[PDB]
Amino acid sequence: NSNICEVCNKWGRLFCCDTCPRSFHEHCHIPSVEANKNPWSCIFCRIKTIQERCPESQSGHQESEVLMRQMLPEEQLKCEFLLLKVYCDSKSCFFASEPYYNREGSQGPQKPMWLNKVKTSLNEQMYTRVEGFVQDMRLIFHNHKEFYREDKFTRLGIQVQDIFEKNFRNIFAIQET
Ligand SMILES: CO[C@]1(C)Oc2ccc(N)cc2O[C@@]1(C)OC
Ligand SMILES: [Zn+2]
Ligand SMILES: [Zn+2]
């Protein structure tokens, strides 16, 4: 197995996948690494198995159909994996914890949103459709771009949103256009 966490790229107390070489800090994996389980397979492996069991799941889909899906276990897992792929980018640090807004010439967003809040909402089964999760993720970046205006720091939101959108299209097999 790898000697660093797949998500944050640091060493520490690591839990090793039994079916691939990846390793994870307990709370960097999503869902958090399960207490007792041998063998244990990581979320990458679990997502791959869904693909293998149903190869046609990789055929192109319409975004509007994906968003309307209820959060059954496979969709729950795909949203957990999509969230994890955002945390895998080191620029996710800017979006992880609860933000605050005090900048001359700007007003904070009406509905603040951040990755750890989305992580909690998934863990608590608060989303009934894919749409709820995707709307909260897009809101994180939209709030950032509106607040920072012409400050070049706006670009961090564009960059992390692009990682989110590329992973969304791949994980949910959105039809290429
Ligand atoms: C959809 O393909 C999977 C399940 O997820 C990915 C998501 C983003 C990117 N970039 C690549 C991915 O490759 C796979 C095979 O995981 C390793
Ligand atoms: Zn980690
Ligand atoms: Zn694995």
Q: Give the chain's domain count.
A: 2
Q: 97 and 160 share a domain? A: yes
Q: 14 and 79 share a domain? A: no
Q: 50 and 96 share a domain? A: no
Q: 43 and 17 share a domain? A: yes
Lining residues, ligand 1, CB within 6 Å: 44, 47-48, 85, 167, 170-171
Q: By alpha-carbon position, which residue is closest to atom 8 of ligand 1?
A: 167
Q: 105 and 139 share a domain? A: yes
Q: 51 and 84 share a domain? A: no
- Give the ligand whose atoms come closest to the C-alpha of residue 28: 2
Q: What is the largest CA-CA distance in the chain?
A: 55
Structure tokens at 47: 């997502």
- Give the ligand whose atoms come closest to the C-alpha of residue 24: 2
CATH number of the structural domain spanning residue 17: 3.30.40.10
Q: 125 and 69 share a domain? A: yes
Q: Which of 78, 43, 80, 84 is nearest to 173 (CA)?
A: 78
Structural method? X-ray
Q: 79 and 7 share a domain? A: no
Domain extent for 35? 1-59
Q: 44 and 84 share a domain? A: no
Q: Which atom of ligand 1 is nearest to the CA of 51?
A: 4
Resolution, expressed in angstroms to one decimal: 1.4
Q: What is the full DSSP assignment across the chain? A: --SS-TTT---SS-EE-SSSS-EE-TTTSSSPPPSS-SS---HHHHHHHHHHH-GGGGS-B-HHHHHHSB--HHHHHHHHHHHHHHHTSGGGHHHHS------TT----SS---HHHHHHHHHTT--SBHHHHHHHHHHHHHHHHHHHTTSTTHHHHHHHHHHHHHHHHHHTTBPP-
